Structure 1
Amino acid sequence: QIAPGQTGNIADYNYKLPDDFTGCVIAWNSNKLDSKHSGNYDYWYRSFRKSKLKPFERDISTEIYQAGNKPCKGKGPNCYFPLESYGFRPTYGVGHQPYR
């Protein structure tokens, strides 16, 4: 998904490249350094947002997002935290392993 014109939860909500993009995307497999046996929860990604991102914008808001119809406060009545942790583990497969 780290490529011009792609869609998905990262291309849409965390990081987007412009369609007219010149540059290089270099991905390294980092399991040795980022994974923990209990899970590395220092890395968070945004799963909920109201709209798609524009090129090179950085949304660092932590305001609670609601997927439902009744405007709620706090967490759990259809109000969700916009970010979710991913516990990286040495035992995950190639597609679930961390990459830098």
Structure 2
Amino acid sequence: NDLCFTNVYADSFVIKGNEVSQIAPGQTGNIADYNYKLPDDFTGCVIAWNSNKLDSKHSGNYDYWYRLFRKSKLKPFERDISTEIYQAGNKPCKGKG
């Protein structure tokens, strides 16, 4: 409460339990590499509280999404909304399977 900040950014996203421990400056994993990477010299703080009442229901819910397939790592504080099938081998294949 005793410091004056030039700007504050609030990035929010639902994520699984272990990837909460994944979220930290200088880390590794499918989320810290392809979905969200924090800067190594991060000046900020993280918040995580459980929510089983708004992200759950009978018969289930599958609205949420995450990426494990990207051409390269995510440089810090970049968003990569794109649906491109990851190439395997040498095929220009565009589809699932």
TM-score (norm 1): 0.70
Distance in 1 (CA, whole Å) between partners of 2:67 and 2:50 is 22
Residues 15-24 or 64-73, more deviating: 64-73
Equivalent residue for 2:70, pick from 18, 38, 49: 49
Unaligned runs of 5+ in 1: 77-100
Distance in 1 (CA, whole Å) between partners of 2:31 and 2:61 is 19
Distance in 1 (CA, whole Å) between partners of 2:60 and 2:33 is 25
Higher strand proportion (structure 1 or 2)? 1
TM-score (norm 2): 0.72
Structure number with bigger Rg: 2
Distance in 1 (CA, whole Å) between partners of 2:93 and 2:35 is 24
The answer to whether residue 39 in structure 2 is matched with residue 39 in structure 1 is no
Point out which structure has higher relative CO (alpha carbons under 8 A, 6+ apart): 1
Identity %: 99
Q: For 1:11, what is the secondary structure of its paired residue? A: helix
Q: Runs of at least 4 residues of structure 1 off by over 4 A?
A: none
Deviation, 1:35, is 1.5
User: Which residue is 2:26 aligned to?
Assistant: 5
Unaligned runs of 5+ in 2: 1-21
Distance in 1 (CA, whole Å) between partners of 2:32 and 2:41 is 15
User: Which residue is 1:64 aligned to?
Assistant: 85
